[PDB]
């Protein structure tokens, strides 16, 4: 019995399964506890078990297998592994491990993985032979990640204008400078749907930090990808833990030569959490923000790169500006000159009912010629030349009108002639 095929089942299904397994009324224990009791009985009936989970090595050296639905938390449904397996198969944080597991014993509180049959969708023999993510040589983005869907609906424009504003490729470093009341969640949903339709080969990773639960349940069953989030109902410890472990998973996937893309929202709240989780450094700058407190977020932002050997790690992080917060002000000030891909959204256009509120002149992409041929190069150059003298709102509405007049970017380029 696999853990995913049992947990992604609805809660009522788990209740009926436990009741059919001859158990006490399962409406009392939590989902993790229900899974634990169900596995306990299903193993009491024999049934050599097959489990899976993302690995986390603690300070002692053992490993815990966390699950994706619980946003990588600690529960009775966790699988314990001794450091002997980590020394043998040469495991590390972020490596998803799947294999045979057994029932627990008295005094033990978690299951034990006996033998691994899959490490990051690979043979356990080749799991020890893999170049480190840090030893890789980063490069610029070369393969263009086209976001144009092709149906020309009222939502496809959201990606069309995107492709008309700043090209995006594998391993690109992305920032979303947008004030509140702007619809960043809509932009993230649109980009997730675009990457799920156009490029289903690369694994999609969407992360929501310090977010309201409604968006969490919306994203967990709207986009085609593994959605891990963390609401504000938990201290900054869980936030920084899930951040570190999702970036470790992404690093392991890239080491396995896989193109991963991490959508993060928001980098500002994540930096806030990283600031309040770290002890003081001795002194204080404006906004109550510590000096080294941004070292970990900055690293998280710099982990994105285009590997020359194989694989890529693209990141798109949304930032919170114009909130009247000294802390957010200094966070955006630090993060401004950090990435090579930026998208600025105008609040004045956002709350003017002109979607998507984009800023053309303020947004751009460094080394964009490596992500597009000369054709779209000259097309975007002409577009920028004609849009630079124009204003903000008038230019935005004119561009969105001329975009909705057609289906794709090619028809717009042709009508622009």
């Amino acid at each position: 019995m696999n853990l995913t095929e049992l947990k992604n089942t609805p809660v009522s299904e788990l209740i009926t399964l436990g009741e059919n397994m001859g158990l006490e009324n399962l409406a009392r224990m939590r989902k993790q506890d229900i899974i634990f009791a169900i596995l306990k009985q299903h193993a009491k009936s024999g049934e050599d078990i097959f489990g899976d989970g993302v690995l986390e090595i603690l300070q002692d050296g053992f490993g815990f297998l966390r699950s994706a639905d619980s946003s990588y938390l600690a529960g009775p449904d966790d699988i314990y592994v001794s450091p002997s397996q980590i020394r043998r198969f040469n495991l590390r944080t972020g490596d998803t491990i799947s294999g045979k597991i057994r029932p627990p014993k008295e005094g033990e509180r978690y299951f034990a993985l006996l033998k691994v049959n899959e490490v990051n969708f690979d043979k356990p023999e080749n799991a020890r032979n893999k170049i480190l993510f840090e030893n890789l040589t980063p490069l610029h983005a070369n393969s263009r990640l086209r976001m144009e869907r092709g149906n020309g609906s009222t939502e496809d424009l959201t990606a069309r204008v995107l492709d008309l504003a700043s090209p995006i490729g594998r391993g690109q470093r992305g920032l979303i400078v947008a004030p509140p009341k702007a619809g960043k969640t809509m932009l993230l949903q649109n980009i997730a749907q675009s990457i799920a339709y156009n490029h289903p080969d690369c694994v999609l990773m969407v992360l929501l930090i310090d977010e309201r639960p409604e968006e969490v349940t919306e994203m967990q069953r709207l986009v085609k990808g593994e959605v891990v989030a963390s609401t504000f109902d938990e201290p900054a410890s869980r936030h920084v833990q899930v951040a570190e472990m999702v970036i470790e998973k992404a690093k392991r996937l890239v080491e396995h030569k896989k193109d991963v893309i991490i959508l993060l929202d928001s980098i500002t709240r994540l930096a806030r959490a990283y600031n309040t989780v770290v002890p003081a450094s001795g002194k204080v700058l404006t906004g109550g923000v510590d000096a080294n407190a941004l070292h970990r977020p900055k690293r998280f932002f710099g982990a994105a790169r285009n590997v020359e050997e194989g694989g890529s790690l693209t990141i798109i992080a949304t930032a919170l500006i114009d909130t009247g917060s000294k802390m957010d002000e200094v966070i955006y000030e630090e993060f401004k000159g950090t990435g090579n891909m930026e998208l600025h959204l105008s609040r004045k256009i956002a709350e003017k009912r002109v979607f998507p509120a984009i800023d053309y002149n303020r947004s751009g992409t460094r080394k964009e010629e490596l992500l597009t041929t000369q054709e779209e190069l000259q097309k975007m150059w002409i577009l920028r030349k004609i849009i630079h003298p124009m204003g903000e709102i008038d230019a935005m509405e004119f561009l969105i009108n001329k975009l909705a007049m057609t289906k794709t970017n090619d028809d717009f380029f042709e009508m622009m002639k």
Partner: protein
């Protein structure tokens, strides 16, 4: 001394829940309690710390009445000749000044009043900000369960209460799960439990509809009446302002899907949705569904509905604990 009170008023973490004005009036109440504890008499007084100008002072309240007990707060209804009262009742004085507000007992009573009022202020703010949600479905995680009452964390220091009658006789929870419910009772002046949230009703089910049915919310299918035996049965009679919209065809759904979805969301509760009629006779004929009756005796003088069922449908017209009747009776 004023430096200490300025430090304690600026060092407030939740300055929103307690701004300078109410913090200073809390300190006024604390100093009044301290002065009460100073003298063996029981005299109520005010402080008026002069928030932004300088240090504090004290007054003396009289509460003019014809009594004589505790003469520190006793002034007759006409003692307004000298000392410039000029009013019948409510005349107070600044007689007492020089109040010590730094000793051990003063500090203790100050801390006591401060913690009491920060509790009161967080209660007031949470109820004022989440009271308008009365009538809507909100989620939340429980944190403590007892044999008489359970607590719920909503977030941002928001605490909801669920009593015994607020829970079903067989529903179950434990700290960690996310349960949803509607807030029905609100007491912004309560000392403890504030957000009385539960479902325990069919109107809650109505709200569920408003969340799950996009048509419901614009009054496309009017819900007339509904009754619920908790975890046992849910009788409901609705009408339709339109003639092409079938309530038993639309609200129930396809092959009994929407009603079964609501049942499995509530934990397997038999729900009988029926069409409302403009006559109590046919209304109670249809309300006992599934059944078949051909006897109607309605009396508006005695409020009596004699609806005799055919022999054989008894176990279907009465049910367990008289459900098909006891709900229909209500």
């Amino acid at each position: 001394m004023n430096k200490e009170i300025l430090a304690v008023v600026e060092a407030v973490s939740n300055e929103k829940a307690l701004p300078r004005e109410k913090i200073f009036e809390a300190l006024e109440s604390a100093l009044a309690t301290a002065t009460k504890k100073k003298y063996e008499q029981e005299i109520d007084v005010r402080v008026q710390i002069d928030r932004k100008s300088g240090d504090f002072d004290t007054f003396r309240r009289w509460l003019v009445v014809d009594e004589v007990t505790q003469p520190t707060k006793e002034i007759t209804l006409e003692a307004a000749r000298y000392e410039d009262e000029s009013l019948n009742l409510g005349d107070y004085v600044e007689d007492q000044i020089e109040s010590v507000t730094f000793d051990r007992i003063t500090t203790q009573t100050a801390k006591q009043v401060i913690v009491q009022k920060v509790r009161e202020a967080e209660r007031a703010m949470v109820v004022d900000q989440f009271r308008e949600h009365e009538g809507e479905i909100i989620t939340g995680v429980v944190k403590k369960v007892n044999r008489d009452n359970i607590s719920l964390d909503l977030g941002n220091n928001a605490e909801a209460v669920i009593l015994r009658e607020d829970m079903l006789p067989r529903e179950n929870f434990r700290p960690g799960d996310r349960v949803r419910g509607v807030l029905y009772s609100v007491r912004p002046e309560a000392r403890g439990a504030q957000l009385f949230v539960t479902r325990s009703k069919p109107e809650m089910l109505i709200e569920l509809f408003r969340i799950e049915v996009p048509e419901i919310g614009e009054e496309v299918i009017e819900i007339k009446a509904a009754a619920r035996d908790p975890g046992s049965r849910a009788k409901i009679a609705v009408k339709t302002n339109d003639k092409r919209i079938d309530p038993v065809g639309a609200c129930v759904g396809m092959r009994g899907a929407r009603v079964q979805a609501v049942s499995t969301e509530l934990g397997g509760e038999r729900i009988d949705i029926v069409l409302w009629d403009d006559n109590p006779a046919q209304f109670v004929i249809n309300a006992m569904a599934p059944a078949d009756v051909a006897s109607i005796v309605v009396d508006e003088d005695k409020h009596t509905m004699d609806i005799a069922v055919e022999a054989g449908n008894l176990a279907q017209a009465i049910g367990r604990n008289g459900q098909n009747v006891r709900l229909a009776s209500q």
